[PDB]
Write a protein that binds this ligand. Structure first.
Ligand SMILES: [Cu+2]
Ligand SMILES: [Cu+2]
Ligand SMILES: [Cu+2]
Ligand SMILES: [Cu+2]
Ligand SMILES: [Cu+2]
Ligand SMILES: [Cu+2]
Lengths: 336, 337, 336
């Protein structure tokens, strides 16, 4: 397309919503290509990530860790307004792994506090893709301070299985997994600081050990459990988008499966089926589709079970419906 | 589907065998869906994992680490009697990744010492799958103390390649890989404890470093080497099932390949072919098929070669038969310049 | 083939070139199977691997880390002459993951200083494959001292996609990634040693932490950046071969994609498509094919970004050509 051709396309303004929910969208594209417009404000803020009151200086797209999920269709244009308010202290930018050129947009979006920028790119490849900050010289520090999220580029015709059959989800949830590296003093207590830049040197020391102190979903231990559990019902088709911008993960739904999994995240590669545990490399997003067949509590975990149960990488689904005894039954309940 | 129709099905009681061997089974299912019955008793026991005498309090399904492989076919019912003897000290349960609902069985099978339970589930999805203990609040500690194994759900028509050609193995071995986290004293010497409970706090400290002290096949360093090496012959088709319930691994057969590898472990996903090194993420099982074409010793390793040769994750195959010089030959043996 | 047939095949002697470049070869084979002859000399030498003057005693096929890429076609025979000069101190050998039997050749090629050997094997399976040294009882120590490389066995009809369409590259580069484990003294300074054997105990202690001190491409921090960036032009098709003999990696082209990725490295397994980040397990090689669409500087990284930008695993591509504003454009440049 020429610049004139693009200027004649319809514009659509999208309101973002906080993870794990996803803004409203249509699976099959309603019409031809659009310029889809989003706006995000960056907030630097302290977050508390566990029940011991441990703090991280988060650098958050839209004020959440992860940043929100943006949804477009193949061959739409994504137009982002990115704002770094004067209340912040650091320069920031954005690299979309879905985009082609200029370091995924990082080289065109460097904004100091009090600045804004607008970037547009054509979403030429369908799939789920990571986005993250990447300021020169400080790339990994922004990413492991929570400045990352994902976008989904749906095929215009919606999702399909390997053999061209349509896959239509009832519910979608976005789980962003974050490794954090919090410094400790000589008594093994986590340190606190009064500004992000003050934590920089101590944090780099921990990062170089390659071992996170916490690995969490949606920005904190227990964020998606108990009463902030994701919900579904028996018979509902659910798409679970999962991203990790820095470190590998191996998601598993305890009690379920991934019926179709795009473990690479890319919808032109056919999905793996019937998976117990799938693998998403650091720097990628993946998606799993599952139809719930049994009610009750499911845990959704990174299946390095130390990372899930000791370091924080565990969420719940609460699923309503009737029990199927053909699939599973207690023949003799625990007894003497 | 009905309670009635299920009690009408034939029952077959299987006697389990210790890894790396697998109980007798047929690849192609003979006749219709069955209720296949297994019994395992849980043992808490001290095991020695290296030649230095390092001890771990293991928590072992059927007394072995890994637990034994169970084989059924798709749409069979697996019925497990699980027994926690009153000589044990902890509650245990089982989560089958092959099963659907109730945390894979784990929410229905919590048994204290002196208790037993019977669980039945329909094996709806073909593949190899991990099982493991998962008691609320102590999940990784029972897994990394050895409490895990695998099952294989064969398609009823047996295995096939990506394009419908039948693949029939002559023999099957199950390699369970285990990461252990053994606490050290001030001299760097491994510690010993009286009961499993006593080791808990020090072991969680090592677990949180995410760095195992030992990574082993079949429960110990060198367990599947020497007189305990797996065996085959030139021309023999072997299926190697490998599981890791907690940590990634990257198996490789030194001197061979994986001719067809279901690296995800699931037989409706077509296999990768001609693999050098394949990758099984923590919490999964995979399977590789190979036809041996050369005699001699092979080593089967996790190809982080520090984990293989320093931490324990190496086994041997001894293969009989004739050498093929077309595939490889020494044109000039090591000689002076 | 008969014995006389094998004995009658044409021989071709190939001069190797240092990575990241590759010796001249044809994609589509020209004529029937051949015996392709290569000679490599092993060098044990001290190399400097970062900007701080940190030394390692490298053990280097042909004098380089990684060793060079050898290219043959399926069902050719590769015949290697391997020489261990009298000035080295250790026995060495070679295991080709491409070969069948005798531990990949390792059992037949153990040469002490002052010895040579000639090994021939038939390249029966197409793909990229790791090769590395593996002397009994000292395998990891030779591998993590740099003694590894890769070979490519191309299909006789050249590369194709999943749907049997030909893929022809214009340029090929080989990126070998190396994890090093360099000991430190109690002051945190890296140690130096007179002879390789003097470093053995201290190095195995670091190896057993599973945490590298440096993760590099082509043997050193920054080896493929600046004036040594890899080059291409918009519209050129590049094949990037990447190996890691001991530890996993997750390559990503910042600003691009892998249009076709043989992540397993084996050309009978259909490629994944449209990849953002792909995953190569330790002990394997992989290959990614990309057509460049935008000019500029791209970084090619291991996307554990701590490993890329703190520990050394980052390279650059410099790509010439005209900017395409359809794919990406700055609608509003950073402004107050
Ligand atoms: Cu930032
Ligand atoms: Cu990135
Ligand atoms: Cu248990
Ligand atoms: Cu599990
Ligand atoms: Cu060597
Ligand atoms: Cu190897």
């Amino acid at each position: 397309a020429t610049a004139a051709e693009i200027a004649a396309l319809p514009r659509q303004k999208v309101e973002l919503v906080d993870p794990p929910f996803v803004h409203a969208h249509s699976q099959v594209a309603e019409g031809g290509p659009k310029v889809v417009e989003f706006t995000m404000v960056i907030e630097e803020k302290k977050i508390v990530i566990d029940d011991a009151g441990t703090e991280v200086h988060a650098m958050a797209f839209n004020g959440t860790v992860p940043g929100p999920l943006m949804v477009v269709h193949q061959d739409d244009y994504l137009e982002l307004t990115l704002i770094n308010p004067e209340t912040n202290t650091l320069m920031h930018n954005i690299d979309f792994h879905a985009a082609t050129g200029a370091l995924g947009g990082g080289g065109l979006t460097e904004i100091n506090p009090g600045e804004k920028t607008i970037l547009r790119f054509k979403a030429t490849k369908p799939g789920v893709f990571v986005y993250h900050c990447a300021p020169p010289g400080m790339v990994p520090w922004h990413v492991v301070s929570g400045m990352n999220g994902a976008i989904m580029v749906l095929p215009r015709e919606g999702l399909h299985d390997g053999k061209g059959k349509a896959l239509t989800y009832d519910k979608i949830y976005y789980v962003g997994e974050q490794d954090f590296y919090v410094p400790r003093d000589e008594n093994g207590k986590y340190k606190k600081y009064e500004a992000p830049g003050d934590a920089y040197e101590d944090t780099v020391k921990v990062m170089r050990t390659l071992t996170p102190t916490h690995v969490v979903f949606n920005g904190a231990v227990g964020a998606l459990t108990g009463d902030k559990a994701m919900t579904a019902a028996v018979g509902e088709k659910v798409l679970i988008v999962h991203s990790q911008a820095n470190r590998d993960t191996r998601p598993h739904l305890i009690g379920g499966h991934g019926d179709y999994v795009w473990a690479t995240g890319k919808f032109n590669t056919p999905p793996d089926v019937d998976q117990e545990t799938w693998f998403i490399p650091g720097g990628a997003a993946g998606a799993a589709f599952y139809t719930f067949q049994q009610p009750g509590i499911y845990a959704y975990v990174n299946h390095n079970l130390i990372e899930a149960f000791e370091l924080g990488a565990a969420a719940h689904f609460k699923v309503t419906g009737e029990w199927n005894d053909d699939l599973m039954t207690s023949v003799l309940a625990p007894s003497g």
